Amino acid sequence: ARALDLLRGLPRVSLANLKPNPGSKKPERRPRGRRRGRKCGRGHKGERQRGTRPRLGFEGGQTPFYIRIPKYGFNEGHSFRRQYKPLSLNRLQYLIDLGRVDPSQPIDLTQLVNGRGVTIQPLKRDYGVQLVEEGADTFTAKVNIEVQLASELAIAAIEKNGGVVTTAFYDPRSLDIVCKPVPFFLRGQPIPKRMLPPEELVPYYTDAKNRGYLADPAKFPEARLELARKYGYILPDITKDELFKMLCTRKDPRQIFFGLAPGWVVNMADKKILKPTDENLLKYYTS
């Protein structure tokens, strides 16, 4: 290129010649000279100049603004509230279009994260992924998707294409594991069991409307059909298609990963999986 041809002519690039990009380095102001010398940008002598100004939010005597306002519980229990990261249908479709999220396999949290489709911070009170209505139209893909929360419209959107959506609860200790499995594998601990929802979320997951993982599968077909009526689409038969087996697969309530049963240990270095044999342990993990 032309720039490289200019370099042919110029003397060698060496440790002498290097200069910063103009504007990057602004020189510092020192309280020397005549301009910045006397009083050095501090004003005339007072509380200000001696550097003993009162703390921030002190109004010189009168009841400060922040204090005089009444207290109200805008943030009363902020740390205990659960947060769901939103995944749009647009986002999901675009991930499938670029081959980042694989439709020939089921989608869960772990697949999405690995796809860089989402960022989840368990520590920051994130409790997984919420599936949002946005971009319901121009969503044309048939997938088995797993999300903690979904809106009825987004359920409808997925089931119109012939996909299957279900909601499954993840406890914080399960979530950090599922999002980043490789670090957990290096912790040397055996896989724990996914805990059941708290009392207030039991009614949610034991409901066919939300497509809960603890909802009665006998209550599923009529629910699917009711949603099909309301949004006026012909509800397709899933059993007919080739990929039916894949759309069937659902991890059980106490399972975090697809093949890996709780209480197993993964030895990464020699690519082995160690099982317990002990009756006590087996009883404990199978509960």
Partner 1 sequence: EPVLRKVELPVPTHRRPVQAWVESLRGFEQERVGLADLHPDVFATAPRLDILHQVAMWQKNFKRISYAKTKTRAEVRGGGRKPWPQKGTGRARHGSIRSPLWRGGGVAHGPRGPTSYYYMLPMKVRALGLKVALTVKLAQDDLHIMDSLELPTGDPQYLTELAHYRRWGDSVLLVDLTHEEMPQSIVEATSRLKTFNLIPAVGLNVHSMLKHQTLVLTLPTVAFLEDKLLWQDSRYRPLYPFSLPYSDFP
Partner 2 sequence: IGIRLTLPPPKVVDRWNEKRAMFGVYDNIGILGNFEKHPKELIRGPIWLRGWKGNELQRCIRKRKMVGSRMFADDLHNLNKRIRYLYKHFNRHGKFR
Partner 3 sequence: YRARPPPRRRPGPRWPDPEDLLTPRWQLGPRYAAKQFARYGAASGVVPGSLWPSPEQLRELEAEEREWYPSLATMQESLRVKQLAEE
Tell which residue, 182, 154, 180, 176, has the closest CA to residue 166. Answer: 154
- Closest separation between CB of residue 105 and partner 1, Å? 14
Q: Residue 240, interface with partner 2 (CB under 8 A)?
A: no
39: phi then psi, degrees, rounded to nearest 5: 75, -20
Q: Residue 50, interface with Mg ion (CB under 5 A)?
A: yes
Cβ atoms within 10 Å, residue 217: 8
Q: Residue 80, interface with partner 3 (CB under 8 A)?
A: no
Q: Residue 32, interface with Mg ion (CB under 5 A)?
A: no
Piece of 48-56, 77-85, 204-212, 260-268 that binds partner 2 (CB under 8 A) = 48-56
Specify whether the CB–CB gap between 163 and 142 falls below 8 A.
Answer: yes
Q: Residue 56, interface with partner 2 (CB under 8 A)?
A: yes
- Binding mask 113-132 toward partner 1 (x if CB under 8 A, else -) reads xx-x----------------
Q: Residue 286, interface with partner 3 (CB under 8 A)?
A: no
Q: Residue 42, interface with partner 2 (CB under 8 A)?
A: yes
Specify whether the CB–CB gap between 131 and 113 falls below 8 A.
Answer: no
Size of the chain, expressed as the number of residues it contains: 287
Q: Residue 280, interface with partner 3 (CB under 8 A)?
A: yes
Provide the token pair at 38.
């006397």
Piece of 24-32, 86-94, 119-127, 195-203 that binds partner 3 (CB under 8 A) = 195-203
Can you give the three-state secondary structure of 151-216, one letter per residue? CHHHHHHHHHCCCEEEECCCCHHHHHHHHCHHHHHHCCCCCCCCCCCCCCCHHHHCCCCCCECCCC
Q: What is the DSSP letter of 78?
A: T
Residues engaged in binding partner 3 (CB under 8 A)? 185-190, 195-196, 199, 202-203, 206, 214, 263, 265, 267-270, 272, 274, 276, 278, 280-281, 284
